[PDB]
DNA sequence: TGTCTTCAACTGCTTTCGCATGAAGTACCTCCCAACTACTTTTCCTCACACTTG
């Protein structure tokens, strides 16, 4: 019982986290670092003064 | 006259990457086709009757 039931776990929980990958890997990707060490997003609106507050 | 609230119907997605190996619909219709048997077809073959004879 323990076994099937961890191979059903196994085999689920790589759909749950496909979208969690793509759904902000969307948004994120534009997100880089400006030459000025601030984050801007590759539009140029900035999200981040400092890469984690200290760069 | 003006603004507000709930519910139900409608929208769009919910692992990735490849092998296999592609197959199969089908009603309505049929004209074509294959069949069994009989019938028909083209060339050829061979004999036969009457009037008259003596």
Redesign the pocket.
């Known amino acids: 019982m323990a076994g099937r039931e961890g191979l059903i776990d196994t085999?689920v929980k790589?759909?749950?986290s496909?979208?969690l990958q793509?759904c902000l890997t969307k948004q994120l990707e534009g997100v880089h670092v400006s030459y000025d060490n601030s984050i801007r997003d590759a539009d140029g609106t900035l999200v981040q003064f400092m890469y984690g507050g200290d760069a």
Do not use: F
Request: hydrophobic share 15%; net charge positive.
């Open positions: 085999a790589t759909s749950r496909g979208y793509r």
